[PDB]
Design a protein around this ligand. Structure first.
Ligand SMILES: O=C(O)c1ccnc2cc([C@@H](OCC3CCC(F)(F)CC3)c3ccccc3Cl)[nH]c12
Ligand SMILES: [Mn+2]
Length: 308
């Protein structure tokens, strides 16, 4: 069965340390950059309201066949394996909980995180079982608003919520402009509505950028991370073991479909760290830190790349 990687570092900054995100990330860097990813729990009283326009929030999630790589005799009428469905936030969550509770035959919050993890990686490599889920991924915060309150005049902000619209940990307030000469001669957060087994495969950010990720609410998001000093070793393991049909593809295109069990990387000398990102917690990925993961259940996340 799947062997869980060691836990990545978790930081619980004081109110004084929480005053500056870039300053705090710079101070934890000597440890966190050696693990690729880290988790940051804000102070207990720091609780931002959910500011998405929930009434009109509608989306068509992408279909994810967990064993699509392992399944590579073509199936009859391949390409039409799933009917397309549009959801609201409510109807997607009702579908999400029904799937997980039917799959494990128990209430969604009673399923151990270790069990969903072991089942996810078994299904990914299983040919005898075709599990298909949906992921509301890469939803632009410009469509229905950010999960954080923002002072843009498009939605009401209560006085007790103004501190969160101005907070440096509001992902809409992270610095995103990279310095360059072209910037003298010449990005918003993305949203992720997850369900059980919805996943994102191994990748690094464009320009080897940092990324910060916040889980607004819902069941945990399980992460795996690799430190940047082992980036070449992971890419070598990919070249050796990933499907040879995709071997010559550029990294940007390869990264779309590169799922790999973390135990395979660990067996080949790649250090891997895990964490369960719970509601209200941050996850920071450092430059060129390969990361991947899946969702334990119905949740809502927001992510953006930032510059230092
Ligand atoms: O789902 C999450 O919580 C989550 C957390 C952290 N990182 C990611 C990345 C993604 C998606 O990739 C978006 C692009 C953006 C442009 C890029 F940065 F150049 C590459 C990645 C994706 C990647 C493969 C398979 C499914 C999905 Cl949805 N989801 C993430
Ligand atoms: Mn990412």
């Amino acid at each position: 069965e799947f062997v869980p990687p060691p836990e990545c570092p978790v930081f619980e900054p004081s109110w004084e340390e929480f005053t500056d995100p870039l300053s705090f990330i710079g101070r934890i860097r000597p440890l966190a950059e050696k693990t690729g990813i880290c988790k940051i729990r804000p102070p207990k009283d720091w609780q931002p309201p959910f500011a998405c326009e929930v009434k009109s929030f509608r989306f068509t999630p992408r279909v994810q066949r967990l064993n699509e790589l392992e399944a590579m005799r073509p199936r009859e009428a391949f390409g039409f394996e799933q009917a397309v469905r549009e959801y609201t936030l409510q109807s997607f969550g009702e579908m999400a909980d029904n799937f997980k509770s039917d799959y494990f035959n128990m209430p969604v919050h009673m399923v151990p995180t270790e069990l969903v993890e072991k089942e996810f990686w078994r299904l990914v490599s299983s040919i005898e079982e075709d599990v298909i889920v949906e992921y509301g991924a890469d939803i632009s915060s410009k469509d229905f608003g950010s999960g954080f309150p923002v002072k843009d005049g498009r939605r009401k902000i209560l006085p007790e919520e103004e501190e969160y619209a101005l907070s440096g940990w509001n992902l809409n307030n992270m610095p995103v402009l990279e310095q360059s000469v072209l910037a003298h001669i010449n990005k918003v957060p993305w949203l992720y509505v997850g369900m059980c087994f919805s996943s994102f495969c191994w990748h690094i950010e464009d320009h080897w950028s940092y990324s910060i990720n916040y889980l607004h609410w819902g069941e945990p998001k399980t992460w795996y991370g690799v430190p940047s000093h082992a980036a070449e070793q992971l890419e070598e393991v990919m070249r050796e073991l990933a499907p040879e049909l995709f071997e010559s593809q550029p990294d940007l295109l390869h990264q779309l479909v590169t799922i790999m069990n973390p135990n395979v990387l660990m067996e080949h000398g790649v250090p891997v760290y895990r964490t369960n990102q719970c509601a209200g917690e941050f996850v920071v990925t450092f430059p060129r830190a390969y990361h991947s993961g899946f969702n334990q259940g119905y949740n809502f996340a927001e992510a953006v790349n930032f510059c230092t």
